[PDB]
Amino acid sequence: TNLCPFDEVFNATRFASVYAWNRKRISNCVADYSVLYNFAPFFAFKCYGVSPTKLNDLCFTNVYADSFVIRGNEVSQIAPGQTGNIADYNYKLPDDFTGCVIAWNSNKLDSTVGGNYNYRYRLFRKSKLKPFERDISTEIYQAGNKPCNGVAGVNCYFPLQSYGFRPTYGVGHQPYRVVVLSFELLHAPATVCGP
Amino acid sequence: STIEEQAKTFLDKFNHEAEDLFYQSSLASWNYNTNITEENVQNMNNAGDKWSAFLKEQSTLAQMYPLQEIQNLTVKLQLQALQQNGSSVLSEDKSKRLNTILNTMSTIYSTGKVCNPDNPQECLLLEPGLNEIMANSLDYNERLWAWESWRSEVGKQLRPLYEEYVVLKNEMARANHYEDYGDYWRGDYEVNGVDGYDYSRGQLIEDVEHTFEEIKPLYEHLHAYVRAKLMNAYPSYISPIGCLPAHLLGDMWGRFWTNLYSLTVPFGQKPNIDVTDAMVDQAWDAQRIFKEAEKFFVSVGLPNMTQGFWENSMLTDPGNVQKAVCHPTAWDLGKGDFRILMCTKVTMDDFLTAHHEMGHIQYDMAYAAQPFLLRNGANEGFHEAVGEIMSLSAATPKHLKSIGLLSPDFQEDNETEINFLLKQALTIVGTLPFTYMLEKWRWMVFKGEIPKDQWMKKWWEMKREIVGVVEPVPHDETYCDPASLFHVSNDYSFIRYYTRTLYQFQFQEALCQAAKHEGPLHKCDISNSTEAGQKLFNMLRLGKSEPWTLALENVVGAKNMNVRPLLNYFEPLFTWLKDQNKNSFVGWSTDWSPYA
Ligand SMILES: *[C@@H]1O[C@H](CO[C@@H]2O[C@@H](C)[C@@H](O)[C@@H](O)[C@@H]2O)[C@@H](O[C@@H]2O[C@H](CO)[C@@H](O)[C@H](O)[C@H]2NC(C)=O)[C@H](O)[C@H]1NC(C)=O
Ligand SMILES: *[C@@H]1O[C@H](CO)[C@@H](O[C@@H]2O[C@H](CO)[C@@H](O)[C@H](O)[C@H]2NC(C)=O)[C@H](O)[C@H]1NC(C)=O
Ligand SMILES: *[C@@H]1O[C@H](CO)[C@@H](O)[C@H](O)[C@H]1NC(C)=O
Ligand SMILES: *[C@@H]1O[C@H](CO)[C@@H](O)[C@H](O)[C@H]1NC(C)=O
Ligand SMILES: *[C@@H]1O[C@H](CO)[C@@H](O)[C@H](O)[C@H]1NC(C)=O
Ligand SMILES: *[C@@H]1O[C@H](CO)[C@@H](O)[C@H](O)[C@H]1NC(C)=O
Ligand SMILES: *[C@@H]1O[C@H](CO)[C@@H](O)[C@H](O)[C@H]1NC(C)=O
Ligand SMILES: [Zn+2]
């Protein structure tokens, strides 16, 4: 039996930044949610829509998992109908989102003494972001009424900023890896479900 | 895109950069305060240089947003904090001269050397030496020698520097669109824009005189009691109707009267409460001290201390292997990092200092959600008031009985009451006139009401007329007596102590009324009172986001500084002093001088 491998993204070596978030699709396999219970300490385990107990005996079309890591006081914005810098410019969840979000502390792995500036998010953006949309653009953000032509300062800023994680931070400024599970049911016959 | 969205984005960028830079600087400073080595000093130097360069650069870019076009009263305060020019308004030559003068004066004060006129091979410094002499000696001539020497060899070299300091600081103040440097200092208490909560810079003066006029009678009675009890130690050096000599106050400058308790104790037979032995015999250590303080803070509704507090804080002296600066400090490194640096010992004094510093940490934790430029006290006299009140609450006999440090069958009399009250008054009530005198003299000097050739004359007239102390030897215009204090040689303000002393008792009275306490205010324990904790927390979370008028009103229900709560605290002592002074004279005469 070809079990759905819900253990390769949960246990990866290095994750991606918030603004550049990767997508892994799961199809043509049987899904076993028992192995998902591993790593017992969970910071936040909430499901919107379906129920975790009844998720086993349900057949869908495709399952999408997205991986990113943020700070502690921003996990609240991975909920629908929530407003914030991460919730507006980096990741959006629809009002009718179905699935669960899993978050846990990752202080030991993702923090380095002297700073870890390899993980970046976005702070300035001309407009908001539609649900399930990415933006890897790196053009200079204009905050004034004069053209910038591409340069830092004067009235121009670089849109993306670096977290700079350190192991001595507080519980809200410590890294927290987050994975989101989304479920879709199309007119195609359902195949993705376990015994 | 109006100026609002331009200022907001600039503030966002500044907020995200200042946090990292200040965290690096704070970590380097903490590493130096734990380990003393050349590498750590260099790390501090680099971090501070980066922080200062970034701060100047941002302050230079912050002048392109005029204040008149911005209306939110939240982003206006951040830009007001950022746009302070300071020394940049002067030329390079004047700025470097000012820095040279300041460093020279600080160096002269730090290495001040006085030597007795018999043998130059052995002579004393300020700390230790002269401090021990005027803190633990009952001799009249030796104290006079120290008092005159420190103002003779050291005071001479500061006056020529002080005059130029005054002139250059006045030039800078007038270049910064002020009136003088005293106006610049008073600008801390200035509030504009909010209707009904305004406060002009000249209002602070009038409030200070109005409060001091009500303070005066209690100070006069305390002065009479101290004068009566100092005539037994110096039978032929004090006049019953005159002013206390300035070199017999138990301190170098007479700032505090703490060291006169051994001479002015009301009831010598009854000792004070000291639980040092009750701590030694029950296996009390530093960890248990801080756990007890945390339990006290939790009992009133305030939260726990973080898991990183217990691991990243050094609460014990490392030993001879390491070298750490033993000075109780509360550290807010930012980004959720809170630490206390203390070489804690098993003592009641350290037991209260733990509460002081943990109240500091709690106050810092309260406003952690505010923007970077608004994370501090409402004014300069709010951050120590919380530490003092939450230290006062922990020294009550009821609280020590509750935690088992005192025997349950301990019955307190009305004599230990008076002993404790007079011990408090020697250090709380005896410092307000000194602060008033010093700040008023500095304000007059900065304004120009005192000519350059009448500085010492006005200084001693004010000392005789306000404080009630008289010089033992005459001083001409070649001396600079105010410059002998630490806060004058080093550029620092001084009215914050007066403001904090008045604020803390207002806070205590408000919280005790919220705790349904019946009896004297000095017997107040705010433990096990959730209603009292919420009332304080409603003010603690504001930071500088609101004017200090509204912050004070949140707790005390009043818009202005008041002294009646302070007087209610010392009412039993006031009645006892009035009863004891029925056969003595209250007041002093300016004419009498020791050298007349
Ligand atoms: C603060 O309260 C605690 C808990 O006491 C309980 O809550 C009070 C509000 C009140 O309702 C009490 O009747 C409750 O029992 C006190 O801790 C207890 O103190 C008593 C002293 O007589 C002692 O016998 C108990 O063993 C203590 N219980 C513990 C330590 O778990 C505490 O003393 C109070 N602090 C004060 C009054 O300053
Ligand atoms: C701080 O100093 C700067 C320059 O040192 C001031 O900026 C100038 O302000 C004057 C005021 O009329 C303007 O005419 C100039 O155009 C400004 N720029 C320069 C380069 O001179 C700034 O105003 C000062 N800050 C305050 C609060 O006065
Ligand atoms: C994650 O990978 C590590 C490294 O091989 C392994 O030791 C651990 O068991 C894995 N976790 C799970 C839940 O399989
Ligand atoms: C700090 O002091 C400890 C105590 O011995 C020592 O091991 C460590 O090397 C010191 N750190 C530095 C940077 O010298
Ligand atoms: C001031 O700016 C803050 C920044 O977000 C905003 O939330 C607030 O509403 C502004 N004040 C007013 C009165 O709109
Ligand atoms: C504070 O810590 C104590 C002991 O760890 C715990 O019993 C208490 O519930 C904590 N308080 C809060 C509000 O979490
Ligand atoms: C204390 O109480 C006693 C009780 O009779 C009283 O006589 C005395 O005057 C009070 N005051 C002092 C200072 O003892
Ligand atoms: Zn303090």
Numbering used by the authors:
A (entry chain B): 333 to 527
B (entry chain A): 19 to 614
The authors write:
Receptor binding and immune escape have been recognized as two major drivers for the evolution of receptor-binding domain (RBD) of the viral spike (S) protein, which is responsible for receptor recognition. Receptor binding is a key step for SARS-CoV-2 infection. In this study, we evaluated the binding properties of BF.7, BQ.1, BQ.1.1, XBB and XBB.1.5 RBDs to human ACE2 (hACE2) and determined the cryo-EM structures of hACE2 in complex with BF.7, BQ.1, BQ.1.1, XBB and XBB.1.5 RBDs, respectively.
In addition, BQ.1 is another descendant of BA.5 sub-variant, which has gained K444T, N460K mutations compared to BA.5, and has evolved into BQ.1.1 and BQ.1.1.18 by gaining R346T substitution. The residues participating in H-bonds and salt bridges contacts in the RBD of the five complex structures are all conserved as expected. In all the five cryo-EM complex structures, hACE2 H34 possesses two structural conformations. The H-bonds and salt bridges interaction network in patch 2 of all these five cryo-EM complex structures are extremely similar. The side chain of F486, V486 and P486 point to the α1 and α2 helixes of hACE2.
